[model samples]
Target: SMLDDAKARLRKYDIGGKYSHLPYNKYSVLLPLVAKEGKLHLLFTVRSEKLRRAPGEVCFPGGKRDPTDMDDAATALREAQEEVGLRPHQVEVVCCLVPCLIDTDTLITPFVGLIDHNFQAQPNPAEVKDVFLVPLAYFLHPQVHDQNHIFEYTNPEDGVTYQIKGMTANLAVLVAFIILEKKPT
Candidate 1:
C-alpha cells in the first residue's frame, strides 16, 4: 500500500511540474512508513509546547541543515534518530523527494526512509511531546479533511497566515495529492 502511494506521489511531477528542481534546494523529510500486510503506519511526532517554532504541531523528526553535520542526508537521518528513537543504522535511506519551501525564508529537503517494526522510539522531551503513529490508509481517508481545519493557525514571525480548510496542509496537501493521484505501481 505504501509502495503504491509513494509511486503515485512521484508521478505528479511529470516533465514540467513545479517540483522540477526539488531536493537540491528544499529541506524537509520524506519520512516513509514501515508497513506490512496493508497495516501501514506513519512515523511522526508532535513538537513540545516548549519549542520556539511550530510548537505542539504534528511534524516529522527534522529541522534545518547545520553546516557542522555531514550533509542534509545525514542531518535528516540524525534528526529522526534524535527526535524520535529511530535508529540511523536501521533506517535505510531510500531516496529524497522534491524540495519545497516551508515558508518564505526556509526551504526543506524531504527524504524517504524505511524502518523495521522492532525499532523502539524514545522521543526527546525537549523537541517532541508525544510520539505516535497514524495509519497511512487513515491519512488517505476523507475524515482527516474535516479535522485538518482544527490545526490551522498563523506563524507569528511570518506575519503571513494559513489554514487547513480540508484534510490538507499547504505542503501535506501537495504530498497527499501526489500519493492519491499518482501512487506507485
Candidate 2:
C-alpha cells in the first residue's frame, strides 16, 4: 500500500522550475527505503568528525552534484553509492520531492527511493562514520524531549538522542506524513 501510494503521490508532484541557475549551491539527497520484516526503514549515515562539514550529524546519503552527473537522480544515486557502498543498480527511485533551501544559499533536492534490504553498507571512513537505519514508523510516533532550535526525537530502542535536525529532520517528517497519512503525534 505504501509503495503504491508513494509512487502515485511523489511522481505526480510538479517540481516546476529549472533549479540549475543557483549561484554556488546545488545538491541532492537520496531518501533510501529498505523493506524489512514487512516494515520500511530509512537508511542514515553519521558524518565522520574528520570531515570539515557538519561532522557527527545524522543525514541521508547525498552530496553536491558531480560535474559528470546527468541529473538530480544521478546525483542522489552516486552519493548513496559513494557514502554507503550502495550500488546504483540496486535502487528503485520513486520520485523527487520539492527541494529545500539550506544555509541561506544552497538549494538541495530530495529524492526518495527503495533500496535492497540485503545490501550491506560499507561506510567510507573518510565521509561516513556509521551507517544505520531507522524504521519509517519511528517518526510517526515521536517523543520530543526538548526544542533545541530544531525538532529532535529520542530513539525508543536505544534511548539515545539522534540529532536528526535541519533538512534531514524535515524530510523525515515529510516522508512519515506521506506514508502514514498522519503527522507525528
* Clashes per candidate, residues 3 or more apart or on different chains: 18, 0
lDDT per prediction? 0.59, 0.80
TM-score (C-alpha, index-matched) for candidate 2: 0.85
Candidate 1 regions off by >4 Å?
Answer: 1-26, 144-185
**lDDT, residue 98, candidate 2:** 81
Measured by TM-score, the strongest candidate is: 2
Off by over 4 Å in 2: 14-24, 147-161, 182-185
The sequence of per-residue lDDT tens digits that candidate 2 reaches over residues 37-123 is: 777788889998987767899989998887899987898899889998999878988877888987798888888988866798899
lDDT by residue for model 1 (10-57), tens: 544532224533444434453656665555555667788998867877
**Candidate 1 accuracy as lDDT:** 0.59
